[PDB]
C-alpha cells in the first residue's frame, strides 16, 4: 500500500506538471481582444408564487415556457412562465425534495431527495392526470441532482458519493459512476449527452463518459464543497460554484482551471450556476440572498439579481436564452430578463 | 380558447394548493437527530406505539407533528442538514452516559456545529440527555471517573437551581447537570434570542418525552410570535 501511495503522489505531481506545461497564458491575457459587457441590469419580469417552503430546485422546459419547480413542502409545481399559470401541482410522497428535472420531450418530470428515490411522473397520460410513472431506488444517499437524457434514460447524482444512469423503462441502473470522495451535489449533461460533469463535496469535479462509465478527467482547485456545476454551451468546458465563495471555469480539453470568479466582499458559497445562451454570462446564486451575473471571460461581476429574501437555491436558463428563473428559500421563483 | 382552459386549470390548482397550504401550516416538522447508541430509535418506537428518511406522524392536543429520522444517509451531515432549517425544532439526542473513546465529546461537537450553523441559527434545538438512568448507575458504581475525560468536572459544583429527583444521589445530579451545562455553554454562547436550546433529562422509555417536545414547540412558536412583535 505504501508503494501505491508513493506512485499516486508521483502521478499527482506529474499531472500537476503537465497541467502547468499546458498553461502558458492566463484567460485574462488571452481575452484582451474582447470588450467587457458592462452592467447587466435584469429585472424580475415574473414572480411565481404558490410554493410554501424553500424551493430547492427548478428545471426549464425545452419550449422555454413550461418549467418544473420543487419545494420542500412536497410540491412539484409545473408553471407556464408566460402567464404565471400553474399547469400542474404534483404532491410528492417525500417532502424533502432537493432536485427536479423536466423531460426534454416535456411528457415527464423527475424529482428526488432525502428519500434516495428518483420519482418520474407522467405529464401526458391517457386520462390527462399525473401519476408516478416510476420510482428509481438504489442510491444509498440523498438524491442531489437528476437530469433526463430522454424519455427512457435518466442520470442522477447522490450523497452516496456516486452517480447513476437509469433505464426508466425497466427501472434498473444502466451504469454506475464512482470516484468522488464526497456527496455529489450536482451534475450537468453535455450538449451531446455523451459525457457529464459532476461536482462533489470533495472539492473536486469529475467528467464521466456515459457509455464507458469511467471517470475521464478530474478537476481540482476549489477549496471547499462544490455545490453547483454546469457545462459551457459549447460542450468543451464547464463551471463550478463552491462553498469557498468562488466560482471557477474549467475546460475539458486542457484538464485545468481557466478562470476564477471571486471577490473580497463575497464570503458566502455558491448554490447554483447557469450559463447564458452564448456562455458570455455566468449566473451564480449565492448564500447572501443575491445572484451574481459574472462576465465569464473577464471574470468581473457584470450584474446583480437582487430581490430574493432568502438563499438563492436554484438557477435555470431557457434553451433559447430569453429568461432566467431563480428559485430561493423564500418560496418564490423569479423570472428575469 | 386555450387561455381560458389554462386559467380554469390554474384556478383548480389554486384551490387545492390553498387546502394544502392550510394542511402544511397546521403541521409542525421536527428533525430527530442523534447517535446510533443515543436511544433515538427507542424514542421513535415509544412515540410510534403511543428508506432515506423515516417519517413519524403524531398528534398532541389535536396538534399535528411530523418528525423525521435520518436513516440511510452518510455521517457527513453538512449538506443534508440544511434541509431542516425551517423545522419547528431539532431534537438532538445525547447518550449522557457515554462520557469512540468519548462519545459525549462527539455529541458536544455535533451540537456546537448545529448551533453555529448559519442555516440552523434560527432553528431551536431540543436537547434530550437520553441516558440519565445509565449515567446514574455508572456514577453510582464508581467506575465513571469522569474527571479524567473532563477535568473541569473536578472543580465543578452542582448549581443552586438544580432540582434533583426524589431519592437521587448528589453525585448523579452533579454529573448530569455538569453535562447539561457543558451543552449550555455552547448554547448560550451567541444565542442572541433567535434560537433556543431546551435541555431535558430524559430516558429512552420516558412517555414524558412527547409532552416535552410539544411544550418546547409551543414555547418556540410563542417566542417566534413575540419576536414578530419585537417583544423578544
Amino acid at each position, epitope marked *: 500500500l505504501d508503494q501505491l*501511495r508513493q506512485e499516486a503522489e508521483q502521478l*499527482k505531481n506529474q499531472i500537476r506538471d503537465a497541467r502547468k506545461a499546458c498553461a502558458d497564458a492566463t484567460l485574462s491575457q488571452i481575452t484582451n481582444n474582447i470588450d467587457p459587457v458592462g452592467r447587466i441590469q435584469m429585472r424580475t419580469r415574473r414572480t411565481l408564487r404558490g410554493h410554501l417552503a424553500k424551493i430547492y430546485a427548478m428545471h426549464w422546459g425545452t419550449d422555454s415556457r413550461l418549467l418544473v419547480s420543487a419545494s420542500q413542502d412536497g410540491k412539484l409545481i409545473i408553471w407556464d412562465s408566460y402567464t404565471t399559470n400553474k399547469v400542474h401541482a404534483i404532491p410528492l410522497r417525500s417532502s424533502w425534495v432537493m432536485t427536479c428535472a423536466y423531460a426534454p420531450s416535456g411528457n415527464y418530470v423527475a424529482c428526488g431527495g432525502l428519500d434516495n428515490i428518483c420519482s418520474i411522473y407522467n405529464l401526458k397520460t391517457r386520462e390527462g392526470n399525473v401519476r408516478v410513472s416510476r420510482e428509481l431506488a438504489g442510491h444509498t444517499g440523498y438524491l442531489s441532482c437528476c437530469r433526463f437524457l430522454d424519455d427512457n434514460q435518466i442520470v442522477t447524482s447522490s450523497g452516496d*458519493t456516486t452517480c447513476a444512469l437509469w433505464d426508466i423503462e425497466t427501472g434498473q441502473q444502466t451504469t454506475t459512476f464512482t470516484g468522488h*470522495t*464526497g456527496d455529489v451535489m450536482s451534475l450537468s449533461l453535455a450538449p451531446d449527452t455523451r459525457l457529464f460533469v459532476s461536482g462533489a*463535496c*470533495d*472539492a*473536486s469535479a469529475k467528467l464521466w463518459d456515459v457509455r464507458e462509465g469511467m471517470c475521464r478527467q478530474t478537476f*481540482t*482547485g476549489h*477549496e*471547499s*464543497d462544490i455545490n453547483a456545476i454546469c457545462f459551457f454551451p459549447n460542450g468543451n468546458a464547464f463551471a463550478t460554484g463552491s*462553498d*469557498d*465563495a468562488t466560482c471557477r471555469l474549467f475546460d475539458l480539453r486542457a484538464d485545468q482551471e481557466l478562470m476564477t470568479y471571486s471577490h473580497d466582499n463575497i*464570503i458566502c*458559497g455558491i448554490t447554483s450556476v447557469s450559463f447564458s445562451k452564448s456562455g458570455r454570462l455566468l449566473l451564480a446564486g449565492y448564500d447572501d440572498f443575491n445572484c451574481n451575473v459574472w462576465d465569464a471571460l473577464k471574470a468581473d461581476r457584470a450584474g446583480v439579481l437582487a430581490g430574493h429574501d432568502n438563499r438563492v437555491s436554484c438557477l435555470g436558463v431557457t434553451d433559447d436564452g430569453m429568461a432566467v428563473a431563480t428559485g430561493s428559500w423564500d418560496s418564490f421563483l423569479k423570472i428575469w430578463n | 380558447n386555450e387561455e381560458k382552459a389554462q386559467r380554469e386549470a390554474n384556478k383548480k390548482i389554486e384551490k387545492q394548493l390553498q387546502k394544502d397550504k392550510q394542511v402544511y401550516r397546521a403541521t409542525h416538522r421536527l428533525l430527530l437527530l442523534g447517535a446510533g447508541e443515543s436511544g433515538k430509535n427507542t424514542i421513535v418506537k415509544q412515540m410510534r406505539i403511543l428508506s432515506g428518511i423515516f417519517e413519524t406522524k403524531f398528534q398532541v392536543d389535536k396538534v399535528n407533528f411530523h418528525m423525521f429520522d435520518v436513516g440511510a444517509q*452518510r*455521517d*457527513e*451531515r*453538512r449538506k443534508w*442538514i440544511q434541509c431542516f432549517n425551517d423545522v419547528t425544532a431539532i431534537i438532538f439526542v445525547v447518550a449522557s452516559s457515554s462520557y*469512540q*473513546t*468519548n462519545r459525549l*465529546q*462527539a455529541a458536544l*461537537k455535533l451540537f*456546537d*456545529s*448545529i*448551533w*453555529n*450553523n*448559519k442555516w440552523l441559527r434560527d432553528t431551536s434545538v431540543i436537547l434530550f440527555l437520553n441516558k440519565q438512568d445509565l449515567l446514574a448507575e455508572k456514577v453510582l458504581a464508581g467506575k465513571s471517573k469522569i474527571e*479524567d*475525560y*473532563f*477535568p*473541569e468536572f473536578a472543580r465543578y459544583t452542582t448549581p443552586e437551581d438544580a432540582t434533583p429527583e426524589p431519592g437521587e444521589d448528589p453525585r448523579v445530579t452533579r454529573a448530569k447537570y455538569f453535562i447539561r451545562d457543558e451543552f449550555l455553554r455552547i448554547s448560550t454562547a451567541s444565542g442572541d434570542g433567535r434560537h433556543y436550546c431546551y435541555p431535558h433529562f430524559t430516558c429512552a422509555v420516558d412517555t414524558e418525552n412527547i409532552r416535552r417536545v410539544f411544550n418546547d414547540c409551543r414555547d418556540i412558536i410563542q417566542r417566534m410570535h413575540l419576536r414578530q412583535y419585537e417583544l423578544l
Partner: nanobody
Amino acid sequence: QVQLQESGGGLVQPGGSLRLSCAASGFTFSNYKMNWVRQAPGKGLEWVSDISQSGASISYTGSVKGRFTISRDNAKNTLYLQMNSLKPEDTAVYYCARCPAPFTRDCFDVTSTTYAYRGQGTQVTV
C-alpha cells in the same frame, strides 16, 4: 487539491514530548478553523483539539487538557500540536483535519469516516 500532510509522529516513552506538524496546501490556511483528531487502534475517530482561524479561540478534548497545545502559523500555512505528559492511550494515528467551509463557526464532519479535507495522519506510539 486540498492537501494536509502530518509529520513528527514517532516512538516516545510515557510522559515524553513530541511536536506534530501539519503542512497545509491548496487553500487559504488563515480562512479555515483547524482540528486535530486521532484514531486509536480498535476505536473510531476521536476529536482532540480545534483552533480558530486566527488562533484566538482554542478548544481541547478533556483527556489532553493541560498536556497538549494546539497552535497555528498562518504565515507558514502550518499547524502544530505540542505533546507533553504523554500516556500510552495517546498512541494513535493523528489526522490534521480542516473544517469544511471558510468563515464559518460550524465544523461539521471532521471526524467522519470518509472526510475529504483530512490528512493521512501520522503514527504516535507511546
